Scaffold this active site. Sequence first.
Site, PDB file in Angstrom:
ATOM      1  N   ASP E  72       0.830  -1.196   0.000  1.00  0.00           N
ATOM      2  CA  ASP E  72       0.000   0.000   0.000  1.00  0.00           C
ATOM      3  C   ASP E  72       0.868   1.251   0.000  1.00  0.00           C
ATOM      4  O   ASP E  72       1.787   1.385   0.812  1.00  0.00           O
ATOM      5  CB  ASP E  72      -0.918  -0.010   1.222  1.00  0.00           C
ATOM      6  CG  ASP E  72      -2.057   0.979   1.108  1.00  0.00           C
ATOM      7  OD1 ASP E  72      -3.087   0.635   0.493  1.00  0.00           O
ATOM      8  OD2 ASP E  72      -1.925   2.101   1.638  1.00  0.00           O
ATOM      9  N   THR E 105      -3.249   4.955  -4.138  1.00  0.00           N
ATOM     10  CA  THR E 105      -2.338   5.737  -3.313  1.00  0.00           C
ATOM     11  C   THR E 105      -0.916   5.758  -3.854  1.00  0.00           C
ATOM     12  O   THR E 105      -0.135   6.628  -3.456  1.00  0.00           O
ATOM     13  CB  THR E 105      -2.329   5.191  -1.886  1.00  0.00           C
ATOM     14  OG1 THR E 105      -1.848   3.842  -1.898  1.00  0.00           O
ATOM     15  CG2 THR E 105      -3.728   5.210  -1.311  1.00  0.00           C
ATOM     16  N   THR E 106      -0.560   4.830  -4.739  1.00  0.00           N
ATOM     17  CA  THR E 106       0.761   4.815  -5.351  1.00  0.00           C
ATOM     18  C   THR E 106       0.799   5.532  -6.691  1.00  0.00           C
ATOM     19  O   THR E 106       1.843   6.077  -7.062  1.00  0.00           O
ATOM     20  CB  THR E 106       1.242   3.372  -5.540  1.00  0.00           C
ATOM     21  OG1 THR E 106       0.956   2.616  -4.357  1.00  0.00           O
ATOM     22  CG2 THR E 106       2.738   3.335  -5.794  1.00  0.00           C
ATOM     23  N   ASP E 403      -8.832  -1.991   1.042  1.00  0.00           N
ATOM     24  CA  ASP E 403      -8.793  -1.382  -0.284  1.00  0.00           C
ATOM     25  C   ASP E 403      -9.937  -1.889  -1.153  1.00  0.00           C
ATOM     26  O   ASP E 403     -10.584  -1.108  -1.862  1.00  0.00           O
ATOM     27  CB  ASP E 403      -7.449  -1.667  -0.954  1.00  0.00           C
ATOM     28  CG  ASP E 403      -6.377  -0.672  -0.561  1.00  0.00           C
ATOM     29  OD1 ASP E 403      -6.624   0.142   0.352  1.00  0.00           O
ATOM     30  OD2 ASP E 403      -5.286  -0.702  -1.168  1.00  0.00           O
TER      31      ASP E 403
HETATM   32  N1  LIG Z   1      -4.285  -7.437 -14.177  1.00  0.00           N
HETATM   33  C1  LIG Z   1      -3.743  -6.239 -14.502  1.00  0.00           C
HETATM   34  N2  LIG Z   1      -3.195  -6.029 -15.717  1.00  0.00           N
HETATM   35  C2  LIG Z   1      -2.654  -4.844 -16.050  1.00  0.00           C
HETATM   36  N3  LIG Z   1      -2.612  -3.783 -15.226  1.00  0.00           N
HETATM   37  C3  LIG Z   1      -3.128  -3.854 -13.978  1.00  0.00           C
HETATM   38  C4  LIG Z   1      -3.736  -5.117 -13.538  1.00  0.00           C
HETATM   39  N4  LIG Z   1      -4.159  -4.920 -12.278  1.00  0.00           N
HETATM   40  C5  LIG Z   1      -3.851  -3.642 -11.940  1.00  0.00           C
HETATM   41  N5  LIG Z   1      -3.232  -3.009 -12.952  1.00  0.00           N
HETATM   42  C6  LIG Z   1      -2.756  -1.604 -12.943  1.00  0.00           C
HETATM   43  O1  LIG Z   1      -1.801  -1.390 -11.905  1.00  0.00           O
HETATM   44  C7  LIG Z   1      -1.936  -0.057 -11.411  1.00  0.00           C
HETATM   45  C8  LIG Z   1      -1.579   0.010  -9.932  1.00  0.00           C
HETATM   46  O2  LIG Z   1      -2.547  -0.692  -9.159  1.00  0.00           O
HETATM   47  P1  LIG Z   1      -2.238  -1.116  -7.635  1.00  0.00           P
HETATM   48  O3  LIG Z   1      -0.746  -1.272  -7.484  1.00  0.00           O
HETATM   49  O4  LIG Z   1      -3.133  -2.285  -7.308  1.00  0.00           O
HETATM   50  O5  LIG Z   1      -2.740   0.117  -6.727  1.00  0.00           O
HETATM   51  P2  LIG Z   1      -2.182   1.617  -6.879  1.00  0.00           P
HETATM   52  O6  LIG Z   1      -3.007   2.206  -7.996  1.00  0.00           O
HETATM   53  O7  LIG Z   1      -2.429   2.220  -5.520  1.00  0.00           O
HETATM   54  O8  LIG Z   1      -0.725   1.440  -7.210  1.00  0.00           O
HETATM   55  C9  LIG Z   1      -3.371   0.360 -11.684  1.00  0.00           C
HETATM   56  O9  LIG Z   1      -3.390   1.662 -12.272  1.00  0.00           O
HETATM   57  C10 LIG Z   1      -3.910  -0.653 -12.672  1.00  0.00           C
HETATM   58  O10 LIG Z   1      -4.301   0.005 -13.879  1.00  0.00           O
END
Ligand SMILES: Nc1ncnc2c1ncn2[C@@H]1O[C@H](COP(=O)(O)OP(=O)(O)O)[C@@H](O)[C@H]1O
Lengths: 77, 96, 105, 99, 540, 147, 525, 364
Positions: E72, E105-106, E403
């Site tokens: 997170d 949040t990232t 989340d």
């Molecule tokens: N299965 C997936 N395939 C491709 N991109 C993904 C997938 N799951 C999440 N993402 C991308 O990763 C990014 C980061 O998501 P995450 O690390 O879960 O939370 P945060 O947005 O707080 O970093 C998101 O903007 C999303 O678009």
Amino acid sequence: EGPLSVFGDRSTGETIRSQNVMAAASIANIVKSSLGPVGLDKMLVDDIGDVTITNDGATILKLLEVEHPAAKVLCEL
Amino acid sequence: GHRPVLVLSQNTKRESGRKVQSGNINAAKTIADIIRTCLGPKSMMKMLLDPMGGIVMTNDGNAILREIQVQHPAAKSMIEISRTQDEEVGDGTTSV
Amino acid sequence: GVAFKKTFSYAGFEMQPKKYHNPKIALLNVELELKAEKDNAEIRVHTVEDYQAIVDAEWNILYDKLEKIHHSGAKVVLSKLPIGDVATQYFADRDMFCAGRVPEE
Amino acid sequence: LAGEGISVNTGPKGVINDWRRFKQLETEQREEQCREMERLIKKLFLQQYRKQRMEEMRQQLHFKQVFEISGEGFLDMIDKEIVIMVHIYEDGTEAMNGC
Amino acid sequence: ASMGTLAFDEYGRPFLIIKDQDRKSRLMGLEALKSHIMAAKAVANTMRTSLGPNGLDKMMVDKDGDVTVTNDGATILSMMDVDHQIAKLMVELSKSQDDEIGDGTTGVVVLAGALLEEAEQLLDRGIHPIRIADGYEQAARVAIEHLDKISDSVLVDIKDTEPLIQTAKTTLGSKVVNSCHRQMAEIAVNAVLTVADMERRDVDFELIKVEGKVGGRLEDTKLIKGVIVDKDFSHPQMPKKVEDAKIAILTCPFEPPKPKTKHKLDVTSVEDYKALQKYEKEKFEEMIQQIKETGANLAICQWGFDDEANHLLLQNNLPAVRWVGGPEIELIAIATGGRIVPRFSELTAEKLGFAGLVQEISFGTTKDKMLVIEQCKNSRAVTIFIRGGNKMIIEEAKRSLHDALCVIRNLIRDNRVVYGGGAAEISCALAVSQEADKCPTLEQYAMRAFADALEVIPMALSENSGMNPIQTMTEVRARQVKEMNPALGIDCLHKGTNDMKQQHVIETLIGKKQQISLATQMVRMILKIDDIRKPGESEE
Amino acid sequence: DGMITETKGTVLIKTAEELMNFSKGEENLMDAQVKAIADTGANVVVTGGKVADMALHYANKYNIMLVRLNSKWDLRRLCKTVGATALPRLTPPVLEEMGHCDSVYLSEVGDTQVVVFKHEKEDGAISTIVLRGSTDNLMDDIERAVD
Amino acid sequence: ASLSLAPVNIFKAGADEERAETARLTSFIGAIAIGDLVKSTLGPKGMDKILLSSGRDASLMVTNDGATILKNIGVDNPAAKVLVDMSRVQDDEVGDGTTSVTVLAAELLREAESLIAKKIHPQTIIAGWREATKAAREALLSSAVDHGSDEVKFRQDLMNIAGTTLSSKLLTHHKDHFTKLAVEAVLRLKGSGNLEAIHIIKKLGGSLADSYLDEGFLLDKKIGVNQPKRIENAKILIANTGMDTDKIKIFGSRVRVDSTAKVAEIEHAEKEKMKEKVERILKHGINCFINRQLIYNYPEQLFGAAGVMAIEHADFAGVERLALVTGGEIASTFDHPELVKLGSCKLIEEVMIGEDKLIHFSGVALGEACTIVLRGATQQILDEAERSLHDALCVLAQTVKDSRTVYGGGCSEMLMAHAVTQLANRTPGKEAVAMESYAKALRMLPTIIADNAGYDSADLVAQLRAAHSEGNTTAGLDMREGTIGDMAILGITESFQVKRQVLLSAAEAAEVILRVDNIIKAAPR
Amino acid sequence: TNDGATILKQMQVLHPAARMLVELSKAQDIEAGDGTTSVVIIAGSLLDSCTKLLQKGIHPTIISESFQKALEKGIEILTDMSRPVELSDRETLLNSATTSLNSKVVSQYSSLLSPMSVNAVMKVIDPATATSVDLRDIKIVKKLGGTIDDCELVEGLVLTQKVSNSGITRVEKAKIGLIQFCLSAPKTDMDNQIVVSDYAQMDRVLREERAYILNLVKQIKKTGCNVLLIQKSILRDALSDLALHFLNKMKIMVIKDIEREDIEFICKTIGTKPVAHIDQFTADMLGSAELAEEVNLNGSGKLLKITGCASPGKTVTIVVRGSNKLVIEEAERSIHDALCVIRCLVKKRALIAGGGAPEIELAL
Ligand SMILES: Nc1ncnc2c1ncn2[C@@H]1O[C@H](COP(=O)(O)OP(=O)(O)O)[C@@H](O)[C@H]1O
Ligand SMILES: Nc1ncnc2c1ncn2[C@@H]1O[C@H](COP(=O)(O)OP(=O)(O)O)[C@@H](O)[C@H]1O
Ligand SMILES: [Mg+2]
Ligand SMILES: [Mg+2]
Ligand SMILES: [Mg+2]
Ligand SMILES: [Mg+2]
């Protein structure tokens, strides 16, 4: 401190210009009271009690201890 | 760190104005009052303690003045004029 | 109008409804909880019946204040002074909103 | 330079004698410093007392001296065995000493 | 260029302006902006590797040595002990994103870092920072409008929860709980849908209880449509299982009454002593009989009770629980549909809560007992019980489930969604570039810098997945330009297709809008600071 | 506020009825006191001590302005400039002890909230000079000049 | 650029951060150090450790338990903290398997370090390990055998499991005796999972073989002054009342009179109240009275005058154990004697164990509570015997709860790794290499078991791998001589739950540690 | 000291092996009572042999099993050398006690201490149908002064508490009574106050307090009691000055500040059943004694002895005297060693020769 990575202080902009002008003004104000027929002489004590009473600007600026290099420029002038 | 930046070096005092004139005049007055009582046929003698260990018991103005140490430059000038009077004519050192 | 943060709700607050369509608001400066009648008040009894009567009198004082508030017709109750858990549950049972420690401003 | 998980194991075993000999003196020094710093740093016509004079010339009717304490003397005077006043001075001190 | 000013007057007299000016430090002009940009870039680059399904975790250690392993962004930034003011600003930005949305949040930190990195070059080319901020704001407005244009709506009906499960899965993909990916998505969706006002109103998280007990497996995490309590039955010989329990929630200790006002009961004779002891015994028997008269099969108190009441409860076949916390009391009352009764005089049958099963739960060789209240009729409160092989993954699962709950709450508030994987960012960058191509030149550089900053998220996703960032991002952008399809993103999981609509990579529109906004105003605030005045004492 | 005893006050409750009726009786008594104060035509009350919450409530109910003066010097000066007598108890004021002012109001000057006791006649026992300025030191110097 | 390696400084004084390579290095070093420390205490030929506390008391502890070794050490490496918490949770869930899970996690992390050195992304390793964990779990579940239906076979399985659990501890000197003791103690619980119903009493002196499981129950409490010291056919009443300056619970009550005669009357009334309470207790028709709280002089004098033994200050555990062993009901009111069940036992007397005297309950009615007397030559011996017996009791209770069992001696690990390898050679990409590393760690577990005995570990492990390759699914490490053999015949049995928990916890901890690429520490307090 | 366990415990050793040997000596003292030095010497010698065994390439597991086999064989060999012994044979008991005391400083005073220990053990246990000896029934009282020759075997009990009845000593045909209540002004467990609003009330208060105390003393006296022991009380004053004055006027010795831990021993020794309320204080709860006298030890202190009791209990007391404290403590330890030796004779009644003969036979 920063990415420049030099072991020393750095001044830039209006700060250094103001410092130079302040030093020049200090040198001028040291001898400004000894100009014209209504001027007055000055005592200079050489840290061992030696007294030098003078009105000449060159002698005053030579005997003084000066550290700022712009002030040194004016003294050399 | 960061030693301070300034025009003149440290321990460089500077006085000006009416204070300097008053100080010079009071220093001269003090020099005069030191030997005021050593003038005339009924003058009283003074004992001066030489730093080397000797004793100078004298009534002469120049002998008294040259045996003392002062910090104020005006007092130094007064002692210098006393010595000048002593050398030029030989007497009148306290009168001047 | 006016809006302010929620102020340390007690137990049983979540059972109260959180929306009213024409509420009457009872602006109060009153401590609605069980407590000593006064800091210098001392009760002297020598009979168990009087003991029970004193306990019931404290409860009845609190419930009389609550009943007056409820019968005033108000649905939202705000108090500068603390509102206890007993009063909060009493208002919850009547579908009433309560909130204590509301600031002066 | 690796192996930060040293697990010093029986290393300190062979040095308990010297370590404890140093630790005893260290603890004594810490206790002395604490006792020294216990006081320091922490906070470093009726009105004219007509009875003052009568107490003055009735006090003189008794002459021994106050004990002069030795760094461990201060420690072990209060550590063992009441209200105690202790005077700190280096040679107005004489007046209060007479008092 | 620091330590304030040092003149000491033109006449040599002392010149003291600010207290302790000899040790205070100041930084002015473009140098301060460059330092702030560098600090924000460092923070963003540190946070960059924790983006996407292939993002890596950070192992935080606090002052006391406790260890937190997490992904997170807000938690990572909160745990960091930073001293730079700009770093604190980025931490507050992450906290704001967590508070408003709960996810992304990232992304906000990376976006702000990219924006400031581009602003560095823009400043080096000789542009006023206010102009850069204005261009950033205009580009952000354009991007937000474009996001509103390409958004898609989903159904938030209880009958069909498939899109909600897909959104929760997309949220949980990056977290470590992806080993139970669909299970956690399902339990989070069910938890949010259970405790919610249907008319798009708020979802009160106080009705969701999240508890974690070590042992078991991460797959053993389950959703309990009731309340689980850390307490147990008071008497050791009370039965460990109650069926069709008629709960009696009470806030009165099973003790003789005691007036709040200070009082003194005078005993003046032997008859007074006998009356007092008879009164005590009668009070105990009367409270137990009053509890029994309502027909309750179980009584739950809050302030505990003493031995006589405990044995009387055991003797009458009434399982009881004592010292239950106030929040737990309220949750039990909400779930079981029963009222909270302050004294036995007011207890009645109509105020009794009903629970299908109340059971005491053991946890292996630990002696720890926990009570579970479930099988309620129309429970309006829910609890989540998380198990794991260590407390650290338990905490990580807690925050991951939080989340997911926040994401489903956002979906409830607004059902418009956009497709992630960098597809939305690429489309927004394309729209920003198109708008800039039709704009006066001076703000064109700011708009193009904003587009390049938007492009960092697909770059980070591709780099974290091992692919070449620039090549893959360029190919995806070219494909988006060729065929009108804003659902093409970065295939982080190597599923063989770039269409995120088919891959069901779904994130809330509000989340992206909040990301873009918060980043834009935070970057504007950072860019507008041209002077720092620090004490410089570096005290202990 | 309702005056209390000077040695020690203890509310001795021996029956339930006294416990129920004590607070109601106290509130009714102080209500009677405040209503008696207000029935004399008084509409501004100035006190040198603290103000009870319930007393403030019952003064609000009867439309009475409450002003609190901590310093006894200010109380004496206000009595001189209005013509009232500083009563030592909560008794309603007699006709000769009732102060009169042309206008009393709450106003803001600059950013300071002040209460003004204003007369219309060009007379009185006390007159006040209101000093404005851009610096505290400047106003202090002007005050020295006024002195 | 990084936070630390930037021209500007972004941290408090004393805080720091470690990036990918440095964080991985520190985590791997810490985990491998923990694994190497906890190992060599594994298998039948494992040694013990000395835990010398550096505190003021300087507690000395000798133990073979991995969890106790790992918890009582000053740990600063965060990954080492993760492994320590893993071991603690493993101990909490089941009694045994702490060393096994710690060693498995360490071996997995060492293989992960090798794979990272081979330029493999940690996500690929994690995915491969997830697949391998699924395959190994399915293989172990398919390999489990249940014997709960047959009573004699289930008892034989319990004996074998207790022997296997005790084989690695100090109790292995008298393995048969302690095995029978633990099995009988667990079977006396009649299916109840409360291990607190079994009390372990450690008395210094005597040989370890002098330890025994009492046929009844033992209490470490005293008796009143004038009460009988021996009762036959005792009717026991267990209570949790005050019976000590018993005060009416009206806290505001007080005695206010105008004469001392009234004070004496009130005192006599209090004494009469206590006497009436004692009379009501005696109305139950009892010989022995047990109270959780203290019993003061007057109630104990009244009990002695009635010839009733009164045992005082038996704590919550004591009263619970007496209720379990005798069947009595813990009572706090004595107004309905007909509604209270009284415990019964054949004999109560005082026994002389060592230099201390204890109360002995014999011929108990229910007996669903046990007391075990441990005799040893040193305090460390007694503590380690208690810990080993606790592990054995926990494993036996788990087996009673779930009767599925697997074969020990490395057989389970061998079949797990065989399934993992069969999956690995069926999958393309570097995930195959990750699964092969998983299998290598699974092999390394019995490899360490054999190494601890000084045997030819490599040859024995190769033989086991071959035997599991042909289809011998019961082959393992025969530790009697240093060969391989059938563990169905040898009876090296072990609980399925323990092995499943070890596998899953080790995989989970390895996965969570491997995901870390940045370690950030705040300024220490 | 000469006791191995005491020597090991007294000096901190700081080494885990040394601490384990200390625990071993403590366990040997618990199980046997003497031989604490021999067991430590045996363990040290065994490990010294293990050094050369390990240096020969032997795993430290074959060593353990072989040592277990040797221990079993040696136990069998020692059992072979054993000789049956009966508790009715006083000579064997005296010889065992003398052998135990031979190695201590009280070896010179053995002709006094060994029969003392034998009698002390024999007087607290049943000579038949006994399997253990509770040494807590043999009270050891250490009084400074005199020599070791002044040790005594008081068959009653000795109390270090002084007589509050200054003036009455040496009560003959004593009827001792032990009470656990307080002889002071009435006081209830519930907090109590007496409110006075009249001078007559003042007079009544002190008069009734005096009458209550007098009634308590009269109730105590009517039972025929002449020696009274009062349990120590901290909550309220156990024995008021007025109660003491009444008891003195009734000619009854009063002993106060009796510890709660000594109540069981006193009741076992005398036969007094404790009384916690004056209602149950009856004559049948008194312990008759032949004499109860407080004696002085040549100016070294005072001791109260109750010697000669009807239906005596199975407890004895040994008074240890010596020039200084150190020899007194060593005499106490040596007497404890002798008592433990006789206890070892009581359970597993088998006797073997000493003098190193069993060790050399084991070696061969
Ligand atoms: N299965 C997936 N395939 C491709 N991109 C993904 C997938 N799951 C999440 N993402 C991308 O990763 C990014 C980061 O998501 P995450 O690390 O879960 O939370 P945060 O947005 O707080 O970093 C998101 O903007 C999303 O678009
Ligand atoms: N008699 C035996 N023969 C072969 N292997 C054994 C035997 N006893 C125990 N083991 C093995 O030793 C391993 C470790 O067991 P142990 O050290 O007793 O507890 P822990 O699992 O906590 O390390 C187990 O996996 C088991 O397979
Ligand atoms: Mg001359
Ligand atoms: Mg996310
Ligand atoms: Mg084991
Ligand atoms: Mg001996």
